[PDB]
Protein: coat protein
Amino acid sequence: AQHNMRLQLTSGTSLTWVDPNDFRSTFRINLNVNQKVAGAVSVYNARSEVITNRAPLVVIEGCTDACSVNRENISIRTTISGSVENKAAVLAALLDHLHNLGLARDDLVAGLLPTTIQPVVEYTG
Amino acid sequence: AQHNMRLQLTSGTSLTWVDPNDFRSTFRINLNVNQKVAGAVSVYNARSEVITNRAPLVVIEGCTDACSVNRENISIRTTISGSVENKAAVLAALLDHLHNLGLARDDLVAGLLPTTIQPVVEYT
Amino acid sequence: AQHNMRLQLTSGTSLTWVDPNDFRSTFRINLNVNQKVAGAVSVYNARSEVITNRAPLVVIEGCTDACSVNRENISIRTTISGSVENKAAVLAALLDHLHNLGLARDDLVAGLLPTTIQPVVEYT
Amino acid sequence: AQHNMRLQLTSGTSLTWVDPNDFRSTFRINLNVNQKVAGAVSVYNARSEVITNRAPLVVIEGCTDACSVNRENISIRTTISGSVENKAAVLAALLDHLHNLGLARDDLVAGLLPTTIQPVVEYTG
Amino acid sequence: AQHNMRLQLTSGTSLTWVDPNDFRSTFRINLNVNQKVAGAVSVYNARSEVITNRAPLVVIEGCTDACSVNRENISIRTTISGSVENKAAVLAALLDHLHNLGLARDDLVAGLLPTTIQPVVEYT
Amino acid sequence: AQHNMRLQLTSGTSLTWVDPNDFRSTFRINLNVNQKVAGAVSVYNARSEVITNRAPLVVIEGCTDACSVNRENISIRTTISGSVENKAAVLAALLDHLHNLGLARDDLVAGLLPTTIQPVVEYT
Structure:
């Protein structure tokens, strides 16, 4: 349907959007910033996390009564902690992380240990 | 350079790769499969977690210096808990999650809460 | 560059904007309206407070260096408590306050107590 | 009338001028200086504050007896805390603060939350 | 004049606007969503209440109400509690409610029981 | 169908009509007049409440709800308390209330706080 989420909760430290059709699918972003000591000098570390929550229905064609709904919680969380000062290397790590996750996802969502895949640093294109 | 990572350790439910150039940037995948109870039925739920860890040098934009060993730790983790049966909706949720994360990342890595982004469902 | 600030948070009686380039320079406005008792009558008093906060790099005049991350916090706050009924005299007092502040600022930011300034009433 | 204030109290840390006509309108400046630690080096922080106090009369045309005065305290305070070392950025912050306050003042003095205004950094002219 | 209200209080659950001229007349919207068990099915029930509050003066001819002491509180409130899922029947009920309110509105405000009116279902 | 409601209960203070097809959907009007002290003047305050009650069924596709057990209660209520003497300002408040309700009506019934709307005084 490609309908965009509508916002529900603002806190200056979190944001909480919701699917207007299904209230069971939430999308939150939490950003926390504080000073850390990197070697000789202090920097500003920003732990972001992005949590998407859903509750799809568990359906077994011969077994699941449609009247009594059977739902399952599913969640995808992503934490990103590094300094704003060095966000260049933060993002360079993010790209490699996302690409390697993509390499693994087909194995992971099927409950299989991704024993074959080979990750990479500094992914180009 | 795109020198791909080298496997270093496999034990239990974990896999651990490392950058052959520096030992500081590593990549782990943990997988925990077990039965979940949802309503009257039980389904096999998989908990994947993918953890990339680095310890880079802090590189200030204005500055340029090969003599600083100023280092911080950085980490990006992604957890995915969902049944194998609904892996269709799990992957749809993953696509939507990745797209919304991309919408937000330029604000999030800069310490700004993404006030202006528009998250979507069922990206196409 | 005069890149205007971006709204980031609205809650209660506060508004919070931020510089889209660095998250360190923010701008808040708090507004508290409630009844005040002055003599036999009561009037609606407004307490505005406008707080601009920054965390800039310390820039020494003689020096020039892109490799220092020496940072201090700086803050400028302005509070205005007065009834809505006398907002005429409130604004007149605000004009006089701003003009006298301007008379003093070159001494005050330099650590010098403005011994030589001449504050006025009803600036024209 | 454009009559300038006359000085009443000197303390080496405060200054207190008064309107010779109305003693109820005071103007004080407090300057406090002390060393702070900015990152690697110590600097001299100077917390200035400028407080103007007044007591205008509350007048309701049909209601306020002229014989019994009804007065209200009103106050405008301004705190400025930063190092003398970095007074360049202190003043660059002051200008933006003053301009944004000007954007808001019409809404603020009328008891309205300035929900429309848009502030700015590095205001030019 | 039809000057429109301006915003005073935001709570993520409550919104409160005020008349910029008269602070006595306010308008709040409160919303509360939570699950509810209808038979054997859980649905998300939303209860929205809309409260407009005012403080008119009691006008007596021959009495110059200096100080505006003779003053009355008046309030109009509207509660709407129903499933987001059955929001269709909720809106049908709202239309029928508004129309029947309009049938009674002249009698009720004059302190008289609207014995004469005849309400309707499914106004068209 | 726009079949109009028919009368069920009369109380001299309460009126209760019902849908002749569905006894679950009812419509009551309650009125209470009594004196009130505004400042130094007593005026006759009338509080009218208008309560429409319904019982929709929770429609789940794939579930033939034989016996109609999955059923929900929904209610829309409106309270109007003010002087008969200031019924002019009461009616002005009612018009502004209805218009602002209409501004929020689509958001509120969907379970979403109407952060975007802007209410008005003195709609014309």
Q: What stands out?
A: The radius of gyration of chain A is 19 Å. Residues 87-109 of chain A form the longest helix (23 residues).
